[PDB]
Design an enzyme around this catalytic site. Structure first.
Site, PDB file in Angstrom:
ATOM      1  N   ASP A 157      51.280  96.024 -30.351  1.00  0.00           N
ATOM      2  CA  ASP A 157      50.878  94.920 -31.263  1.00  0.00           C
ATOM      3  C   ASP A 157      51.171  95.344 -32.713  1.00  0.00           C
ATOM      4  O   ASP A 157      50.467  96.222 -33.221  1.00  0.00           O
ATOM      5  CB  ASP A 157      49.393  94.696 -31.071  1.00  0.00           C
ATOM      6  CG  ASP A 157      48.758  93.727 -32.058  1.00  0.00           C
ATOM      7  OD1 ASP A 157      49.516  93.094 -32.856  1.00  0.00           O
ATOM      8  OD2 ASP A 157      47.497  93.629 -32.012  1.00  0.00           O
ATOM      9  N   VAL A 158      52.179  94.791 -33.338  1.00  0.00           N
ATOM     10  CA  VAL A 158      52.565  95.198 -34.720  1.00  0.00           C
ATOM     11  C   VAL A 158      51.435  94.953 -35.726  1.00  0.00           C
ATOM     12  O   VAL A 158      51.503  95.560 -36.808  1.00  0.00           O
ATOM     13  CB  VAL A 158      53.894  94.572 -35.179  1.00  0.00           C
ATOM     14  CG1 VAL A 158      55.030  95.190 -34.391  1.00  0.00           C
ATOM     15  CG2 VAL A 158      53.916  93.047 -35.070  1.00  0.00           C
TER      16      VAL A 158
ATOM     17  N   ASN B  36      61.963  94.457 -36.190  1.00  0.00           N
ATOM     18  CA  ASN B  36      62.391  93.143 -35.678  1.00  0.00           C
ATOM     19  C   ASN B  36      61.180  92.249 -35.371  1.00  0.00           C
ATOM     20  O   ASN B  36      61.344  91.004 -35.506  1.00  0.00           O
ATOM     21  CB  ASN B  36      63.325  93.277 -34.469  1.00  0.00           C
ATOM     22  CG  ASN B  36      63.557  91.948 -33.792  1.00  0.00           C
ATOM     23  OD1 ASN B  36      64.363  91.138 -34.311  1.00  0.00           O
ATOM     24  ND2 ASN B  36      62.869  91.704 -32.665  1.00  0.00           N
TER      25      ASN B  36
ATOM     26  N   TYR C 208      54.381  83.177 -43.857  1.00  0.00           N
ATOM     27  CA  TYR C 208      55.637  83.639 -43.233  1.00  0.00           C
ATOM     28  C   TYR C 208      56.678  83.947 -44.319  1.00  0.00           C
ATOM     29  O   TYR C 208      57.292  85.051 -44.261  1.00  0.00           O
ATOM     30  CB  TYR C 208      56.154  82.578 -42.252  1.00  0.00           C
ATOM     31  CG  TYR C 208      57.438  82.962 -41.564  1.00  0.00           C
ATOM     32  CD1 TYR C 208      57.409  83.790 -40.467  1.00  0.00           C
ATOM     33  CD2 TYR C 208      58.661  82.471 -41.981  1.00  0.00           C
ATOM     34  CE1 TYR C 208      58.579  84.148 -39.806  1.00  0.00           C
ATOM     35  CE2 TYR C 208      59.842  82.822 -41.342  1.00  0.00           C
ATOM     36  CZ  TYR C 208      59.790  83.673 -40.251  1.00  0.00           C
ATOM     37  OH  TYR C 208      60.925  84.044 -39.615  1.00  0.00           O
TER      38      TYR C 208
ATOM     39  N   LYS D 295      58.483  87.560 -45.105  1.00  0.00           N
ATOM     40  CA  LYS D 295      59.955  87.709 -44.959  1.00  0.00           C
ATOM     41  C   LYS D 295      60.564  88.109 -46.311  1.00  0.00           C
ATOM     42  O   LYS D 295      61.457  88.956 -46.317  1.00  0.00           O
ATOM     43  CB  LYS D 295      60.609  86.404 -44.493  1.00  0.00           C
ATOM     44  CG  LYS D 295      60.210  85.934 -43.094  1.00  0.00           C
ATOM     45  CD  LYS D 295      60.721  86.826 -41.969  1.00  0.00           C
ATOM     46  CE  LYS D 295      59.669  87.616 -41.239  1.00  0.00           C
ATOM     47  NZ  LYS D 295      60.334  88.471 -40.206  1.00  0.00           N
TER      48      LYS D 295
ATOM     49  N   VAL E  12      68.416  80.465 -35.449  1.00  0.00           N
ATOM     50  CA  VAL E  12      69.214  81.233 -34.447  1.00  0.00           C
ATOM     51  C   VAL E  12      69.094  80.553 -33.082  1.00  0.00           C
ATOM     52  O   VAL E  12      67.942  80.324 -32.624  1.00  0.00           O
ATOM     53  CB  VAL E  12      68.762  82.699 -34.387  1.00  0.00           C
ATOM     54  CG1 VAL E  12      69.579  83.452 -33.348  1.00  0.00           C
ATOM     55  CG2 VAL E  12      68.863  83.356 -35.758  1.00  0.00           C
TER      56      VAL E  12
HETATM   57  C1  LIG Z   1      64.566  73.619 -45.531  1.00  0.00           C
HETATM   58  C2  LIG Z   1      63.093  73.280 -45.228  1.00  0.00           C
HETATM   59  C3  LIG Z   1      62.231  74.545 -45.283  1.00  0.00           C
HETATM   60  C4  LIG Z   1      62.609  72.293 -46.298  1.00  0.00           C
HETATM   61  O1  LIG Z   1      61.218  71.982 -46.027  1.00  0.00           O
HETATM   62  P1  LIG Z   1      60.626  70.664 -46.645  1.00  0.00           P
HETATM   63  O2  LIG Z   1      60.992  70.556 -48.081  1.00  0.00           O
HETATM   64  O3  LIG Z   1      59.204  70.654 -46.194  1.00  0.00           O
HETATM   65  O4  LIG Z   1      61.519  69.556 -45.904  1.00  0.00           O
HETATM   66  P2  LIG Z   1      61.458  69.152 -44.352  1.00  0.00           P
HETATM   67  O5  LIG Z   1      62.828  69.007 -43.742  1.00  0.00           O
HETATM   68  O6  LIG Z   1      60.533  70.034 -43.595  1.00  0.00           O
HETATM   69  O7  LIG Z   1      60.784  67.727 -44.648  1.00  0.00           O
HETATM   70  C5  LIG Z   1      60.955  66.549 -43.822  1.00  0.00           C
HETATM   71  C6  LIG Z   1      60.020  65.516 -44.398  1.00  0.00           C
HETATM   72  O8  LIG Z   1      58.652  65.976 -44.203  1.00  0.00           O
HETATM   73  C7  LIG Z   1      57.983  66.042 -45.442  1.00  0.00           C
HETATM   74  N1  LIG Z   1      56.958  67.080 -45.395  1.00  0.00           N
HETATM   75  C8  LIG Z   1      57.095  68.390 -44.976  1.00  0.00           C
HETATM   76  N2  LIG Z   1      55.970  69.065 -45.087  1.00  0.00           N
HETATM   77  C9  LIG Z   1      55.058  68.142 -45.599  1.00  0.00           C
HETATM   78  C10 LIG Z   1      53.708  68.252 -45.944  1.00  0.00           C
HETATM   79  N3  LIG Z   1      53.012  69.378 -45.786  1.00  0.00           N
HETATM   80  N4  LIG Z   1      53.097  67.140 -46.427  1.00  0.00           N
HETATM   81  C11 LIG Z   1      53.805  66.011 -46.565  1.00  0.00           C
HETATM   82  N5  LIG Z   1      55.088  65.799 -46.265  1.00  0.00           N
HETATM   83  C12 LIG Z   1      55.657  66.914 -45.784  1.00  0.00           C
HETATM   84  C13 LIG Z   1      59.084  66.273 -46.466  1.00  0.00           C
HETATM   85  O9  LIG Z   1      58.561  65.899 -47.716  1.00  0.00           O
HETATM   86  C14 LIG Z   1      60.147  65.319 -45.903  1.00  0.00           C
HETATM   87  O10 LIG Z   1      59.727  64.013 -46.234  1.00  0.00           O
HETATM   88  P3  LIG Z   1      60.878  62.942 -46.568  1.00  0.00           P
HETATM   89  O11 LIG Z   1      62.103  63.109 -45.661  1.00  0.00           O
HETATM   90  O12 LIG Z   1      59.994  61.752 -46.214  1.00  0.00           O
HETATM   91  O13 LIG Z   1      61.235  63.086 -48.044  1.00  0.00           O
HETATM   92  C15 LIG Z   1      62.884  72.603 -43.852  1.00  0.00           C
HETATM   93  O14 LIG Z   1      63.716  71.465 -43.693  1.00  0.00           O
HETATM   94  C16 LIG Z   1      63.044  73.506 -42.637  1.00  0.00           C
HETATM   95  O15 LIG Z   1      62.055  74.045 -42.142  1.00  0.00           O
HETATM   96  N6  LIG Z   1      64.249  73.651 -42.120  1.00  0.00           N
HETATM   97  C17 LIG Z   1      64.470  74.489 -40.946  1.00  0.00           C
HETATM   98  C18 LIG Z   1      64.292  75.967 -41.280  1.00  0.00           C
HETATM   99  C19 LIG Z   1      64.919  76.928 -40.286  1.00  0.00           C
HETATM  100  O16 LIG Z   1      65.949  76.599 -39.695  1.00  0.00           O
HETATM  101  N7  LIG Z   1      64.334  78.149 -40.203  1.00  0.00           N
HETATM  102  C20 LIG Z   1      64.440  79.148 -39.139  1.00  0.00           C
HETATM  103  C21 LIG Z   1      63.660  80.456 -39.465  1.00  0.00           C
HETATM  104  S1  LIG Z   1      61.842  80.504 -39.320  1.00  0.00           S
END
Ligand SMILES: CC(C)(COP(=O)(O)OP(=O)(O)OC[C@H]1O[C@@H](n2cnc3c(N)ncnc32)[C@H](O)[C@@H]1OP(=O)(O)O)[C@@H](O)C(=O)NCCC(=O)NCCS
Ligand SMILES: CC(C)(COP(=O)(O)OP(=O)(O)OC[C@H]1O[C@@H](n2cnc3c(N)ncnc32)[C@H](O)[C@@H]1OP(=O)(O)O)[C@@H](O)C(=O)NCCC(=O)NCCS
Lengths: 662, 662
Positions: A78-79, A105, A176, A180, A208
């Site tokens: 458990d890290v 990792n 998170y 990171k 991924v």
């Molecule tokens: C890039 C990223 C972080 C941007 O996050 P974000 O700014 O919250 O945008 P999201 O794509 O999650 O948002 C989608 C919608 O939900 C809304 N939303 C997200 N969190 C919200 C919250 N807590 N309260 C209200 N609205 C929220 C955004 O405002 C957006 O609304 P809209 O399209 O009506 O303008 C997100 O799109 C994401 O998680 N992408 C994938 C990440 C990934 O691939 N990671 C892998 C490693 S862990």
């Protein structure tokens, strides 16, 4: 490919955390195929045992001899638990007599909550598992690698932890993102001290392609999971905003909650005596359904209703409310007069799938290489990077060319605001949280009291002595506007008490209570894992704990301060300050975006008391006094009520989530 | 089994420029050992045949078959000869049927002069060989790679071309630094367009241990070469400084030059006829000898004397000197009355060794991994990186963990200066160089005339219509202080002419005369190498040509402007603007440091008209006019007489070498 790399890592010993599945499982496999000896460690023994069994079978088919002794496992590691990690190091040395590579990792997703809803225990768990664990293992293995003359430490960070000079917001995931960003910030600031023997790098993949992302074993995909999270937070924020708007124009919070407790959208929109904000809320909810789900008939689930009352309580909105002022916190789920039935989803599957495709399409559209890398692709990259002998202090980006464009970069300050903006502080209350930074706390209190005519500066300290030291630096006339509150339990309790005693602050300045330690990897007196944990508590968690109250205060601006280094110091304190600057910037950027989605709309900005170049640090008293005065100007610039640059898109952006160095 | 890493590159075809020696030679060898096919290209058949034979021999010894066919060469391939590069692509296709990897490795050291001493032909030679050659090959190979569905382009840059968001000064090497920065900036800004099929990355090693750095066959080592160059530039700068200080006090340039022509340190020390500046210079030179060298007995060689009179001429200091203005430029080396003897060295061997040790010791001390990587180490890293399929748009750093600390990050403007500082413009002359940016040129002229009370803005344009368009945007009373000078030959002659007519400028703003093209790798209408060469000429060389004159003007501030993108444009112009911003920042940072070593001490700062984030670009008329106003405010901030280093070390550093985006 996989049978023809036997020469790449021949005889190298690797300890890989989270080595049962995903990238970790693939790195274990490819290191073994490349002739390395692997200790794979994980929590789950079944996944670990199957993964090792599959690797050993492949080693046999490509004609390794002695395959059982080449790949070993340790389960129930458990890290988040130091004793458990120490067992992983001991097992590696018992099996193989040395450690060449440490692959950090293992990771958890964390709280998946907005900062204002996130528990301290959930934050602490994410930071312990994802970031403090990595320092624990570095502390134990680095001396072994230095003594043998070589080693490689690789941290598996994320593209969402940001990149050097460029923070990224990760809303709903601040714990998170910090963990990171921290993994990377360690590589940027500490690689100097692990050299010359040890290479120290990171990888930062984004999404991924594999079982965890896709969804397997009857589990939703990570885009689907964020889609669901998004809709729940949209409903919470919508109900919360309506309650706050009603309380602002003078509806009793007891009346707002008695009306929400009926938890009936059709009745709420129709009822004449309900406040306009609740009627309009209920109307909008009643239009969001699909014929199966219930969130069009009920405003709230017990869980969202619990999160709502917590936000109202933490904003001090129960202080004068007879019933709620005293209700047990244990009962925050139990106040609804009817709840959605358990035989039907609350949320519409169609909107979950729609939000998940907004999430997936958004990242997939920003890949230069057009497709998400697979776990094997990222593991292959990792195994190729581990063979290099010339890179240290870098973050490799095996992300598919992921490019999220943003302008959240650390800035050096040389600018100012109008006296008219400062005049809006006249008669207001401000809170300064600090202890050790006496010169900075004193000058900031003076600037608010003398230059901005604030009525009250509440200086929230760890000790009475910390208060007296700041007070002793003010003229008697200025000190008469300085109020002492000494923390008795925790900062959130001290903030609740300050709010109860002297009212709503216009500006909160959060500074760390303790100075950074003057040590890191020195054989004589290194920074122990417990000490590093306290640095994280005092310099990251502290700001989170202040932020989660401050983000609930109407018309308040929040200012987070990263560490200072005493003039003339030549220790690793300067590396530790730059580690914190990077790691806290992930928090600042993320929280600034979350706060704009809350009815309270609290701006948050970060000011840095350490520069990037140690020779540019203040080196005499004149430069020190210059920095102290610049610091107070920076606090007023992001702390004074924000100008009407609502007209300018450009200007609006440069007063939320900035990191400014003085 | 011990040596098998064929799974990494089996059957992959690479074209490697400079493939016969150094890093390129070792990359060709390691790709072949990893199962790759290589076309090695270079100038000398003899060196290519040795490299190929050694690789073929080693392949045979590792048990490869059909080994002749796997390693091929083409001679007479020179990166300054673009036809020979096309021949290299053709030969790869003839030999192997395809190209998988393009390794842009060949390069030249360039002029090894300060910007004020560097010729345009020497600059052009460096940029063509090191930067445009890379684009030429990209232009030809990208379509081949996109058609087969896969490829990799790897640019061999240098640590001293900087890294993303952080420029680095490379004094005496501005041509080289710009070329190296440009190779990285292409990766950062163009990878999006080479995707999804083609990965596009750089490496940026610093010093690399091998024959070239060490030196062979009596050739000086690179550290020794820089040491000698430093002593030559310190002697030229000291003689130049004394001459300028004498002229500032009102000693006639002809009198200073007649005394220097005697070229005798001991006589110049003692003779009361001589200005104090020349007496002090002679004394200092007299003390620097070693009993063998002559620079303690003579101030100047013909070559240093030629460089001295060229600087004085280009500063306009011969305008009223009768003998000097008329002298033909071909006689700049012929005016000394005695010259150091040809049998003895001018420079002391011991001070060359001491400088070489400062240079070498400096970078060695900044290596986290303690040891300079070898050519083999850097080639091995490259061959490992080329096997990864998930990275694009990045610069790998196989440098030994080289870390040169600096604070040269691109900044976004929110800063201001005292009206008192703007008021020192009152009565002064400003030059604005430009053509296409009418709104920006007009608002900047208006700001200088109306807000700062400049007496005269000389608008230096390519056409009369370019002047007329700016003049038409100004009120008639402001336009009274606008002077036209239309370029008739080159910008340097227009600057000489403006200086002769209207006197020494306080501020020079350089803007590009031409708009960026709206294309890059599109199959229908790509940016051709000749068009890319014109982009370089118009957006990098143009500023170099302005800077080499401006850097010689007492009390002048130099401002360089990077490209704008028309509102609503969605072409690769945005990528080209960001490519130029990065690449020009190498020039800005390098020239700021060089200029502090010159007696004229001309500050240089860069203003960017394009943002890093495309959605942040102005999107309506109102945002356009806000950017235009902000641009002129940014020119005033870095264009008005600056804050003294004595007032603040922190403030002084901000206002030299900055890159600020509006
Ligand atoms: C890039 C990223 C972080 C941007 O996050 P974000 O700014 O919250 O945008 P999201 O794509 O999650 O948002 C989608 C919608 O939900 C809304 N939303 C997200 N969190 C919200 C919250 N807590 N309260 C209200 N609205 C929220 C955004 O405002 C957006 O609304 P809209 O399209 O009506 O303008 C997100 O799109 C994401 O998680 N992408 C994938 C990440 C990934 O691939 N990671 C892998 C490693 S862990
Ligand atoms: C790091 C580096 C670029 C910094 O350049 P720099 O600021 O000019 O410093 P240098 O080491 O060249 O300077 C040595 C001295 O000469 C001076 N100097 C150098 N160029 C000068 C010039 N044109 N005029 C006057 N003085 C000059 C410096 O100011 C310094 O004087 P100091 O000791 O009195 O301070 C340089 O040290 C260097 O070239 N290092 C090696 C880079 C390398 O390894 N290259 C890899 C292959 S591309």
């Amino acid at each position: 490919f996989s049978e023809n790399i036997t020469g790449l890592h021949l005889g190298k010993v690797a300890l890989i955390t989270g080595g049962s599945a995903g990238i970790g499982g693939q790195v274990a496999r490819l290191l073994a195929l490349a002739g390395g000896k692997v200790m794979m460690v994980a929590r789950r023994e079944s996944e670990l045992a199957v993964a090792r069994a599959r690797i050993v079978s492949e080693l046999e088919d490509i004609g390794f001899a002695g395959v059982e002794r080449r790949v070993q496992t340790l389960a129930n590691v458990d890290v988040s638990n130091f004793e458990s990690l120490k067992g992983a190091v001991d097992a590696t040395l018992k099996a193989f007599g040395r450690i060449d590579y440490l692959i950090n990792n293992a990771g958890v997703a964390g709280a998946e909550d907005m900062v204002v809803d996130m528990g301290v225990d959930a934050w602490d768990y994410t930071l312990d598992a994802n970031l403090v664990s990595n320092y624990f293992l570095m502390h134990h293995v680095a001396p072994l690698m230095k003594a043998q003359g070589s080693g490689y430490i690789l941290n598996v960070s994320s593209y969402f932890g940001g990149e050097k000079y460029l923070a990224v917001a990760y809303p709903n995931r601040a714990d998170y993102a910090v963990s990171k960003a921290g993994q990377r910030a360690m590589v940027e600031s500490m690689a100097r001290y692990l050299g010359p023997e040890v290479q120290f790098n990171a990888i930062a993949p984004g999404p991924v392609d594999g079982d965890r992302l896709s969804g397997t074993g009857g589990k939703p995909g990570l885009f689907e999971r964020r889609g669901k999270l998004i809709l729940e937070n949209k409903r919470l924020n919508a109900v919360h905003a309506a309650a706050i708007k009603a309380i602002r124009r003078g509806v009793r919070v007891e009346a707002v909650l008695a009306r929400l407790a009926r938890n009936d959208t059709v009745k709420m929109s129709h009822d004449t005596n309900n406040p306009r904000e609740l009627r309009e809320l209920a109307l909008a909810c009643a239009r969001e359904g699909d014929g199966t789900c219930t969130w069009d008939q009920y405003l709230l689930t017990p869980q969202i209703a619990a999160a709502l009352v917590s936000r109202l309580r933490q904003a001090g909105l129960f202080l004068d409310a007879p019933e709620w002022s005293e209700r047990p916190v244990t009962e925050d789920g139990d106040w609804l007069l009817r709840v959605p039935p358990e035989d039907a989803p609350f949320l519409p599957a169609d909107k979950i799938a729609a939000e998940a495709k907004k999430v997936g399409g958004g990242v997939l559209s920003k890949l230069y290489l057009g497709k998400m890398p697979t776990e094997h692709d990222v593991a292959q990259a990792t195994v190729f990077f581990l063979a290099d002998r010339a890179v240290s202090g870098e973050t490799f980006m095996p992300s598919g060319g992921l490019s999220v464009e943003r302008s959240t970069t650390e800035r050096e300050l040389f600018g100012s605001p109008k006296q008219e903006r400062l005049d809006q502080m006249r008669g207001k209350t401000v809170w300064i949280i600090g202890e050790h930074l006496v010169d900075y706390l004193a000058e900031t209190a003076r600037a608010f009291i003398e230059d901005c005519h604030a009525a009250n500066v509440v200086l929230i300290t760890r000790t009475a002595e910390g208060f007296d030291a700041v007070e002793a630096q003010l003229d008697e006339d200025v000190a008469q506007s300085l109020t002492s509150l000494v923390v008795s339990s925790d900062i959130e309790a001290a903030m609740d008490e300050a709010l109860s005693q002297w009212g709503r602050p216009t500006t909160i300045l959060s500074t760390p209570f303790t100075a950074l330690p003057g040590k890191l990897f020195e054989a004589q007196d290194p920074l122990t894992p417990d000490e590093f944990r306290e640095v994280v508590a005092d310099n990251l968690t502290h700001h989170f704990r202040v932020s989660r109250r401050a983000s609930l205060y109407d018309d308040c601006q929040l200012v987070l301060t990263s560490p200072d280094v005493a003039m003339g110091d030549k220790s690793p304190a300067f590396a530790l300050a730059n580690f914190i600057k990077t790691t806290l910037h992930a928090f600042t950027a993320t929280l600034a975006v979350e706060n704009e989605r809350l009815v309270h709309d609290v701006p948050v900005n970060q000011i840095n008391l350490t520069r990037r170049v140690q020779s540019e640090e203040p080196r005499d008293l004149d430069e020190h006094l210059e920095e102290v005065r610049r610091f107070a100007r920076a606090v007023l610039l992001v702390g004074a009520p924000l100008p009407d640059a609502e007209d300018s898109r450009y200007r609006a952006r440069i007063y939320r989530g900035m990191s400014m160095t003085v």
